[PDB]
Short mmCIF file of C-alpha atoms in Angstrom, two decimals:
data_model
loop_
_atom_site.label_atom_id
_atom_site.label_comp_id
_atom_site.label_asym_id
_atom_site.label_seq_id
_atom_site.Cartn_x
_atom_site.Cartn_y
_atom_site.Cartn_z
CA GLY A 1 142.18 96.05 164.55
CA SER A 2 139.69 94.16 166.85
CA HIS A 3 139.72 90.90 165.09
CA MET A 4 141.03 92.23 161.85
CA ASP A 5 144.50 93.80 162.45
CA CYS A 6 145.44 91.85 159.08
CA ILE A 7 143.77 95.01 157.41
CA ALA A 8 146.08 97.66 157.46
CA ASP A 9 144.94 101.24 158.57
CA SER A 10 145.90 102.83 155.13
CA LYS A 11 143.34 100.60 153.58
CA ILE A 12 140.52 101.53 155.59
CA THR A 13 139.12 104.44 153.55
CA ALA A 14 135.83 105.69 152.27
CA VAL A 15 137.37 105.51 148.70
CA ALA A 16 138.03 101.85 149.23
CA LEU A 17 134.80 101.06 150.88
CA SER A 18 132.67 102.83 148.16
CA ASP A 19 133.39 100.26 145.27
CA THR A 20 131.78 97.37 143.51
CA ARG A 21 131.75 93.65 143.13
CA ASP A 22 134.91 92.13 144.88
CA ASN A 23 137.14 95.29 144.60
CA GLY A 24 138.43 94.90 148.42
CA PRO A 25 141.74 94.09 150.32
CA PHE A 26 141.27 90.16 150.02
CA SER A 27 141.03 87.83 147.31
CA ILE A 28 138.20 85.59 147.34
CA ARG A 29 136.78 82.32 146.23
CA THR A 30 133.39 80.75 146.25
CA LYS A 31 131.73 77.17 146.92
CA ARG A 32 128.25 76.07 145.86
CA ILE A 33 126.13 74.65 148.38
CA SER A 34 123.27 72.57 146.64
CA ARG A 35 119.53 72.66 147.77
CA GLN A 36 119.56 69.14 148.64
CA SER A 37 122.64 69.71 150.70
CA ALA A 38 121.53 72.49 152.58
CA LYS A 39 119.42 71.40 155.71
CA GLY A 40 116.83 74.30 156.19
CA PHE A 41 117.30 76.27 153.31
CA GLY A 42 117.34 76.35 149.47
CA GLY A 43 121.13 76.24 149.02
CA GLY A 44 123.48 79.13 148.37
CA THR A 45 127.00 80.53 147.71
CA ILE A 46 129.67 80.58 150.27
CA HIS A 47 132.05 83.57 149.65
CA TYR A 48 135.29 83.37 151.40
CA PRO A 49 138.85 85.31 151.66
CA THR A 50 141.74 83.28 150.30
CA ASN A 51 144.58 85.38 151.86
CA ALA A 52 143.04 86.30 155.32
CA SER A 53 144.92 83.80 157.31
CA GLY A 54 146.67 86.53 159.23
CA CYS A 55 143.39 87.55 160.69
CA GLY A 56 142.90 84.52 162.72
CA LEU A 57 139.31 83.45 162.86
CA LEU A 58 136.75 85.22 160.96
CA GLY A 59 133.20 86.66 161.29
CA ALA A 60 130.48 84.89 159.15
CA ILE A 61 127.25 86.52 157.66
CA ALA A 62 124.15 84.78 156.19
CA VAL A 63 122.25 86.95 153.69
CA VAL A 64 118.80 86.27 152.58
CA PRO A 65 116.21 87.43 149.74
CA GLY A 66 112.79 88.67 149.76
CA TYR A 67 109.30 87.41 148.46
CA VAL A 68 109.22 86.17 144.96
CA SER A 69 112.96 86.78 144.83
CA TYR A 70 115.89 84.56 144.65
CA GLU A 71 119.46 84.67 145.49
CA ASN A 72 120.42 87.21 142.77
CA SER A 73 118.39 89.87 144.72
CA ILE A 74 121.28 89.87 147.39
CA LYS A 75 124.01 88.17 146.01
CA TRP A 76 126.19 91.09 145.72
CA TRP A 77 126.80 91.32 149.24
CA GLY A 78 128.73 88.15 149.27
CA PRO A 79 131.86 89.48 147.20
CA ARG A 80 131.67 92.78 148.83
CA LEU A 81 131.84 91.55 152.37
CA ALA A 82 134.11 88.36 151.64
CA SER A 83 136.65 90.72 150.08
CA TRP A 84 136.64 92.82 153.39
CA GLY A 85 137.44 89.58 155.42
CA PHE A 86 134.15 87.83 156.15
CA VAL A 87 132.80 84.29 155.06
CA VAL A 88 129.46 85.13 153.67
CA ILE A 89 126.81 82.86 152.58
CA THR A 90 124.03 84.20 150.16
CA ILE A 91 121.23 81.94 150.12
CA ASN A 92 117.99 80.79 148.19
CA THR A 93 115.14 79.92 150.55
CA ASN A 94 113.21 76.70 150.16
CA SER A 95 110.39 78.60 148.41
CA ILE A 96 110.45 82.09 147.22
CA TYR A 97 107.03 82.59 149.19
CA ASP A 98 108.38 81.82 152.54
CA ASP A 99 107.27 84.46 154.92
CA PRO A 100 109.64 86.41 157.46
CA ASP A 101 109.75 84.12 160.44
CA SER A 102 110.44 81.18 158.03
CA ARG A 103 113.44 83.32 156.56
CA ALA A 104 114.52 83.77 160.02
CA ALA A 105 114.83 79.85 160.54
CA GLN A 106 116.59 79.72 157.14
CA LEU A 107 119.28 82.34 158.07
CA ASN A 108 119.80 80.36 161.26
CA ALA A 109 120.30 77.11 159.23
CA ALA A 110 122.69 78.95 156.74
CA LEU A 111 124.92 80.11 159.62
CA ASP A 112 125.16 76.64 160.87
CA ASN A 113 126.00 75.40 157.36
CA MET A 114 128.92 77.65 157.39
CA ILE A 115 130.18 76.82 160.77
CA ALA A 116 130.06 73.17 159.87
CA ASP A 117 131.39 73.38 156.49
CA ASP A 118 134.56 71.40 155.32
CA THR A 119 135.95 74.24 153.68
CA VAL A 120 135.48 77.48 155.62
CA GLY A 121 134.12 75.99 159.15
CA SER A 122 137.65 75.90 160.56
CA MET A 123 138.06 79.52 159.41
CA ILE A 124 134.97 80.77 161.33
CA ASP A 125 134.62 81.97 164.90
CA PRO A 126 131.23 80.69 165.52
CA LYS A 127 130.63 83.54 168.12
CA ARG A 128 130.91 86.27 165.57
CA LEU A 129 127.85 85.98 163.22
CA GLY A 130 125.83 88.73 161.07
CA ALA A 131 122.70 88.56 159.21
CA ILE A 132 121.49 90.61 156.20
CA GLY A 133 118.21 90.34 154.42
CA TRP A 134 115.88 92.16 152.02
CA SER A 135 112.30 92.80 152.50
CA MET A 136 110.70 89.71 154.00
CA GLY A 137 114.23 88.49 154.51
CA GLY A 138 115.00 91.96 156.40
CA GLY A 139 112.13 90.93 158.70
CA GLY A 140 113.62 87.41 158.94
CA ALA A 141 117.08 89.30 160.22
CA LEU A 142 115.11 91.07 163.00
CA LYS A 143 113.61 87.94 164.13
CA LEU A 144 116.79 86.00 164.15
CA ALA A 145 118.24 88.63 166.25
CA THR A 146 115.76 88.10 168.89
CA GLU A 147 116.67 84.32 169.00
CA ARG A 148 120.29 83.88 168.42
CA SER A 149 122.89 85.57 171.01
CA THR A 150 125.84 84.75 168.47
CA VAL A 151 124.24 87.07 165.75
CA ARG A 152 126.23 90.32 166.72
CA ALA A 153 124.96 92.55 164.01
CA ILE A 154 122.09 92.59 161.61
CA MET A 155 121.25 94.82 158.64
CA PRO A 156 117.64 94.62 157.36
CA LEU A 157 117.17 96.04 154.09
CA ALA A 158 113.48 97.51 153.23
CA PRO A 159 112.49 95.24 155.94
CA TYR A 160 108.91 93.74 155.77
CA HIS A 161 107.61 91.49 158.88
CA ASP A 162 103.87 91.97 159.31
CA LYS A 163 103.69 89.90 162.97
CA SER A 164 105.15 90.60 166.36
CA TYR A 165 108.67 89.42 166.72
CA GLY A 166 109.81 90.94 169.89
CA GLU A 167 112.69 92.99 171.47
CA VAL A 168 115.79 93.72 169.45
CA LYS A 169 118.91 94.62 171.26
CA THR A 170 121.31 93.52 168.69
CA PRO A 171 123.39 96.25 166.61
CA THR A 172 120.97 97.03 163.96
CA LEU A 173 121.63 99.08 160.64
CA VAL A 174 118.18 99.40 159.06
CA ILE A 175 118.31 100.66 155.22
CA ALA A 176 114.89 102.06 154.52
CA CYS A 177 113.30 103.10 151.06
CA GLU A 178 111.64 106.67 151.30
CA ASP A 179 108.80 105.69 148.94
CA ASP A 180 108.63 102.07 149.76
CA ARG A 181 104.95 101.11 148.95
CA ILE A 182 105.21 97.42 150.19
CA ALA A 183 106.89 97.90 153.39
CA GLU A 184 105.81 101.39 154.00
CA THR A 185 108.27 103.13 156.16
CA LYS A 186 105.76 104.31 158.81
CA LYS A 187 104.41 100.99 159.45
CA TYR A 188 107.53 98.80 159.10
CA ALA A 189 111.37 100.16 159.08
CA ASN A 190 110.73 103.35 161.21
CA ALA A 191 108.72 101.29 163.90
CA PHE A 192 111.44 98.65 163.84
CA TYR A 193 114.13 101.36 164.12
CA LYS A 194 112.30 103.00 167.06
CA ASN A 195 111.68 99.86 168.89
CA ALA A 196 115.26 98.69 168.89
CA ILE A 197 116.88 99.10 172.12
CA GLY A 198 120.80 98.51 171.15
CA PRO A 199 123.11 100.29 168.80
CA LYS A 200 121.11 101.42 165.79
CA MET A 201 121.29 103.51 162.89
CA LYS A 202 118.79 103.99 159.98
CA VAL A 203 119.71 105.28 156.45
CA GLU A 204 116.55 105.96 154.19
CA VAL A 205 117.44 106.14 150.55
CA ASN A 206 115.88 109.31 149.06
CA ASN A 207 112.91 108.59 146.76
CA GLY A 208 113.48 104.81 147.02
CA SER A 209 111.22 102.06 145.96
CA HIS A 210 110.92 98.73 147.58
CA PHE A 211 113.63 97.55 145.49
CA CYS A 212 116.17 100.32 146.41
CA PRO A 213 118.59 98.04 148.47
CA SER A 214 118.09 94.98 146.12
CA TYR A 215 119.65 93.57 142.80
CA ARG A 216 122.98 95.95 143.26
CA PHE A 217 120.68 99.20 143.30
CA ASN A 218 122.59 101.63 145.37
CA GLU A 219 125.54 99.13 145.69
CA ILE A 220 128.19 101.98 146.17
CA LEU A 221 125.83 103.93 148.61
CA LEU A 222 125.44 101.12 150.77
CA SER A 223 128.69 99.37 150.62
CA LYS A 224 130.31 101.89 153.00
CA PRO A 225 127.86 101.91 155.98
CA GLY A 226 127.17 98.10 155.59
CA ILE A 227 130.90 96.77 155.63
CA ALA A 228 131.59 99.47 158.49
CA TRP A 229 128.52 98.37 160.53
CA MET A 230 129.50 94.47 160.31
CA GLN A 231 133.20 95.31 160.95
CA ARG A 232 132.54 97.63 163.93
CA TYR A 233 130.01 95.06 165.48
CA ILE A 234 130.98 91.66 164.45
CA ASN A 235 134.67 92.30 164.67
CA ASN A 236 134.93 94.83 167.09
CA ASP A 237 137.05 97.13 164.85
CA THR A 238 136.60 100.71 165.81
CA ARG A 239 138.81 101.90 163.05
CA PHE A 240 135.57 101.86 161.09
CA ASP A 241 133.86 104.13 163.60
CA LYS A 242 134.56 107.26 161.33
CA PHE A 243 132.03 105.90 158.97
CA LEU A 244 129.20 105.31 161.54
CA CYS A 245 126.51 107.28 163.34
CA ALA A 246 127.41 111.06 164.29
CA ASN A 247 130.95 110.47 162.76
CA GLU A 248 129.50 110.50 159.25
CA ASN A 249 127.12 112.77 157.87
CA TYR A 250 124.96 110.72 155.59
CA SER A 251 122.22 113.46 155.76
CA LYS A 252 124.40 115.47 153.50
CA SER A 253 124.24 112.89 150.41
CA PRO A 254 121.50 113.85 148.06
CA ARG A 255 120.69 110.13 147.74
CA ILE A 256 119.64 110.06 151.46
CA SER A 257 116.37 111.47 152.63
CA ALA A 258 116.54 110.66 156.45
CA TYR A 259 119.41 109.54 158.80
CA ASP A 260 118.96 108.51 162.44
CA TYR A 261 121.15 106.74 164.95
CA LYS A 262 121.44 106.06 168.70
CA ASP A 263 124.09 104.45 171.11
CA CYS A 264 126.61 103.88 168.40
CA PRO A 265 129.40 103.39 167.41
#
């Protein structure tokens, strides 16, 4: 249960988590936030569940794209996680050329936008937040984690950050791409994972390019660990423990070339 006893045990299955789009236990709606309305980011889409009132207050997650990419690179996380009970904002940045530290600031502003929003703000527990980002946006999520203690979990996807960002103790699920030639894993994802000091898990997608966790590539593959991680650490729902760390043998998947975890779940 943690904060989501409104999800029945019998719905918490690998089959249910391993699905596409808004196939999940809650129905959802969206609200568009314009670029001009957004203070500190380029606008985005808020996704929220419409029949989750039995859950009490909900966790909220901001999701940011990478370099020279727009919201559509990461938008699919919005319906996926909202149908599992989160409020989720998938954003555009001010410029597609903004760097990783700028994307951390824009994730921060997007979290604040949801918390204050006239539609979803009253549904949100502002202490239970999460962040996801691809490429330079994954770097932004790592940086944000060092700065905002109400961010309870992050999921950096093919993360790129080419400057010091500091020590991360936030629960971190790194999705790496084996054959990444932009954010080479030896320099970026593997070092970020090694240096994190809290709960942490890393799934490397076999033969993946830098695009491997973007534009709905590998959607079914990543949905189960991603939803489980966010439920475990944003909502303290240990019913998702069975899909995480030593409890789920991701290294058996022919689509996964490396699997590591520590201090979880």
